[PDB]
Amino acid sequence: MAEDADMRNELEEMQRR
Amino acid sequence: VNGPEILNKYVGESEANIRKLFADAEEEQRRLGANSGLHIIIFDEIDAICKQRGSMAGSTGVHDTVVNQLLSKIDGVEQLNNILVIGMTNRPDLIDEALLRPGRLEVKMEIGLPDEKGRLQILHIHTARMRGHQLLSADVDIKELAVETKNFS
Amino acid sequence: IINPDWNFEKMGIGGLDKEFSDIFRRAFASRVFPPEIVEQMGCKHVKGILLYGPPGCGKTLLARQIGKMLNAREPKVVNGPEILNKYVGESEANIRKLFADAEEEQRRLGANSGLHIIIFDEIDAICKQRGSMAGSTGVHDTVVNQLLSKIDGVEQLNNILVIGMTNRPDLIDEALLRPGRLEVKMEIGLPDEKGRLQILHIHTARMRGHQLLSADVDIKELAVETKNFSGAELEGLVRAAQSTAMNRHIEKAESLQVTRGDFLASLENDIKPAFGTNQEDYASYIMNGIIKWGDPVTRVLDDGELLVQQTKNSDRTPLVSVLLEGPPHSGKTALAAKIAEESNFPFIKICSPDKMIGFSETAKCQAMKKIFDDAYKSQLSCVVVDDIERLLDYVPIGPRFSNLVLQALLVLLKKAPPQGRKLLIIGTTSRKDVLQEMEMLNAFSTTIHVPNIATGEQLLEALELLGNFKDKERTTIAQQVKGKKVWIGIKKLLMLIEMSLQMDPEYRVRKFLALLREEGA
Amino acid sequence: VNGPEILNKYVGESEANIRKLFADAEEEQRRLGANSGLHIIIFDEIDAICKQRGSMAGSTGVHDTVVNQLLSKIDGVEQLNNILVIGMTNRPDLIDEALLRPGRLEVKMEIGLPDEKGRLQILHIHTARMRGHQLLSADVDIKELAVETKNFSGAELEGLVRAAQSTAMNRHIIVDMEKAESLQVTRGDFLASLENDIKPAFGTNQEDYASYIMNGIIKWGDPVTRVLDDGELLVQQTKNSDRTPLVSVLLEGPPHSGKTALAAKIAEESNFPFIKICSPDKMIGFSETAKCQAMKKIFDDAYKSQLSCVVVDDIERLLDYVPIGPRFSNLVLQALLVLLKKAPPQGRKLLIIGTTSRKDVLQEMEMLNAFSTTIHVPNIATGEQLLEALELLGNFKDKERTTIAQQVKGKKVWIGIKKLLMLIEMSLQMDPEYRVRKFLALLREEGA
Ligand SMILES: Nc1ncnc2c1ncn2[C@@H]1O[C@H](COP(=O)(O)OP(=O)(O)OP(=O)(O)O)[C@@H](O)[C@H]1O
Ligand SMILES: Nc1ncnc2c1ncn2[C@@H]1O[C@H](COP(=O)(O)OP(=O)(O)OP(=O)(O)O)[C@@H](O)[C@H]1O
Ligand SMILES: Nc1ncnc2c1ncn2[C@@H]1O[C@H](COP(=O)(O)OP(=O)(O)OP(=O)(O)O)[C@@H](O)[C@H]1O
């Protein structure tokens, strides 16, 4: 391996109106 | 902390779980500086979390940002007089002298395969619980066990 | 009138009386001035202190002290990364959460404003060179591409100084280091003795004002007897002094009495190792010391003393290079160590094959390079290479060696440190002929032939020295040696002594001499 | 906008902050078509926000593809006129060229380092106020500075200025009080020179020749002049002629002759815009591939200029060379030997030197055939030549000069300087009578 993957992700907003 | 619990796929959570440890003590130090109680921290395996960050062991160590955060945290711009962190290794040489230097960890000790006296005391310990209830008093030479056992750990 | 500093007498510092003055004039003189002359001048304030050095040399202390005790503000401090976060954009946003209390403040107070400060720490983690960062694109690229955009940014905020600190400043981007984003690149380094005693004067002042300390401690001796201590080590020296005193002073049953520090350095300098020299590195390589068997040893170590005195005194030879040839089992390393031990240069790390095993030549040469770069920090030093032919892999047969480590070695022998510094590079080998063949021998400035024991006379007087064999039996070995020649080196001798010794006394010397027949032959 | 300032976590907010930028400028287009107040955008550090779409390594996010929204907005289906947009970047080459094609962004303009005389404008423009309010002496010469700053650019140029005003203050600035004195009459005068020396690094370092030059150059006879003349007659080749934009020299001699030092001498005497010494000192442990890349980068940045010179020291070490058996690294050789005969683009002139202690290794590697010419460095051959050298040095007084001089001329000497220094030194350290005797006795074995 010798593997470094550091990642991010995004949000799906809920409908509260 | 037992080995890594910290390391996470996502960025930044692996430093959040590190500072999670000490934030419990930071607040107490700020509220009571002088007379606060210890928060001891215990790293079971230091070597896996922090290995040398000197662009060695591949690319920048393995995720050396962790050790950056740690040695920034304990000796950082805040005094944080109220903790000692225990660390334990069977592979000491990896660890950065930057971390081992006086004040981040001052004292590096070696524990070694004991001499006859220690190998006696340890046996007497593990046997005293059982003798006190008089289970074995039978012809068991402890000195003979010890001197028979040359190097055992 | 607004002046941000009402008191600093002296703060938590010694040894840096140059560096604090330089940093002060550069980045607090614009601050502390009549405003009228500076707007006549039309100059923009320098911002962007950087501090680069080795560990344990008191950099974050300095930043702490200036920021929080010198001038009136609370500084926002990031500890390593605090920034980085699982979500895109919010990591970057925390940067502007730092700057966004001073940006509007400057916008709506104009030129005059309360100073804001930011102390970064271990900044090399968050920022590194682009294009080489964690793969092709990089994860850490947009935090730095924001940071540069803000510090010299188009808003031209004038009200901050950024204090960074590193142990790896080459990583840091020139784009960030050019003037105005970080103006001052300041080395802080292992202190000279007078600063070193200043450290102790400070950390012992609060112990001295009270009379706990004992009169028998003159810290100038302690300056002499800790050469290279960073000061982070030195506090630890003092700290364990207090601790030993306390343990001397006491289930627990602590006995309540009043206590006095004494003999700290003498007791526990042997305990703690350091970044610089050790006392103890030597006893490994010289276990038996150096016994004088003749004029050769005089010649050799006198040449070594002479040469280190050359380096110490002279100029226009910033480095020197010597090697010690001997036949095998003629101690080269003992002499090479005792030379340094008598030279009393402050920094000695032997570079030896024994502490590097299985290492591929790449990491090998990186290690020796690390040693020499550590040595180039100090004002002068003595570095020992030993067993060169094993340091660089060597075998005669189908002759093989590592080319890379050879070339790195001898360019370093031909290399000069920054001016004013001075060193010698001692080497050893049992053969210099192959070194002539590979044309590194010329690089060595001089050589010393170590002779090997040539005479039963030198042998038997060495045995008077060692005292293993008494005169009665030695009368026989005299009659055996006289008239005959001997080629044996002492490291082999010192095997033969015990190899004979372990027999019974009657056959003792007969085995010894019958054994020595083999090597002299 | 700062570069990433657009970016936000919610999937559509990244683009939805761009449309905020361009909504005004399209709305006034609609309302007033022909003209508008020219809403302009300034991107900053644009390389991060826009880079080529087909690299996701390290991101693991689609948001590398905001760019598609961007350039699909800029020309789009709806042409937008009366907008100006400017990008700013350190790194030009990572941009998707879909927006470098004309009409999204027309101009690729490259601002290089300042020219020598424009640097004067750069200097005087800052010092205007300083002189107008009579905080500048008439002694300082901006031209004396501007020639004395080789690669200073911009902030690096302004750094000595900003520091100089500080050093000038600090005297009048000054314990507990840390008083600021009242005296307002001052100016920094020839402390900008001092700060030019010490305080900033140039950011492109040629300042230090010291590690290469410890003693300057002792002018020890006719040969050194012959060499320096041949060299400065050769340097004119580049500057005069446009059909030999590349010229290549060897310095051939025995070891310990300071060849690589006088190379630096002739470079600084040529006083070119861009000069460099490619050392094996700076590169250690580097495998042959990186050892090629570094050299590659050197020549590549040298081509940027209208001319340059470069020296290569101890090529036999650079391309690792040992007999015992022929052994070396080949890739560096190939690179170097291509680069000698690589002609720069359109008469951007280059000069190259290389140095070796061995020509006999090279003439089979066909390197000096590639070199244009070679010049020999003879080393001191006799007692008179030697005695002139050491009386230029000093560190033998007249009695010692004679004491040597009796018995040298009957003998023939083969010596070089870099050894001679160490000889005089180690012999010198001994006590006074012993000094010359030891120097002599060392020379007995060394020069024979
Ligand atoms: N004048 C001084 N010089 C050096 N060290 C000092 C001095 N005065 C006190 N110290 C001690 O040095 C210790 C370490 O220095 P500092 O707090 O700056 O971190 P540091 O070790 O320099 O960080 P790093 O290891 O990253 O360089 C301090 O905790 C302090 O106890
Ligand atoms: N005055 C002395 N001179 C030289 N050696 C001495 C002297 N006194 C004692 N010795 C012994 O010489 C030994 C030297 O061993 P050394 O480190 O030279 O191995 P070595 O000879 O380099 O190995 P090799 O023969 O493979 O080169 C030491 O163990 C030391 O005890
Ligand atoms: N006329 C001269 N020509 C050449 N060198 C000179 C002259 N006068 C003095 N020197 C000295 O030569 C020294 C540099 O020697 P240097 O080590 O460069 O020789 P070298 O041939 O590079 O050695 P090596 O072959 O081991 O690389 C400088 O200190 C310089 O002062």
Numbering used by the authors:
A (entry chain H): 1 to 17
B (entry chain B): 285 to 437
C (entry chain C): 208 to 457, 468 to 738
D (entry chain D): 285 to 458, 465 to 738
Paper excerpt:
To improve the detail of the reconstruction, focused refinement was performed, in which all but the NSF D1 and D2 domains was masked; this approach yielded two classes of complexes with near-atomic resolution (FL-20Sfocus-1 and FL-20Sfocus-2, 3.8 Å and 3.9 Å, respectively). Given the similarities between these classes, further discussion will focus on the FL-20Sfocus-1 structure. The SNAP-25A N-terminal residues are present within this pore in an extended conformation reminiscent of a β-strand with side chain density and close packing with NSF, enabling identification of the register in the density maps. The presence of the SNAP-25A substrate leads to remodeling of the pore loops, with a majority of the conformational change arising through rearrangement of a highly conserved amino acid residue, tyrosine 294. In the case of protomers B–D, each tyrosine Cδ1 atom intercalates nonspecifically into every other space between amino acid side chains of the substrate and is engaged in a stereotyped hydrogen bonding interaction with the nearest substrate carbonyl. Here, in the FL-20Sfocus classes, this loop is present in some subunits and packed to varying degrees against the substrate. The nucleotide occupancies of the D1 ring in the FL-20Sfocus-1 and FL-20Sfocus-2 maps are consistent with a structure poised to disassemble substrate, in which protomers B–D are ATP-bound, and key amino acids are in place to catalyze hydrolysis (despite the absence of Mg2+ under the non-hydrolyzing conditions of the sample preparation). Nucleotide densities associated with the D1 domains of protomers A and E are ambiguous.
The archetypal Type II AAA+ protein NSF (N-ethylmaleimide-sensitive-factor) plays an essential role in eukaryotic trafficking through its disassembly of different SNARE (Soluble N-ethylmaleimide-sensitive factor attachment protein receptor) complexes.
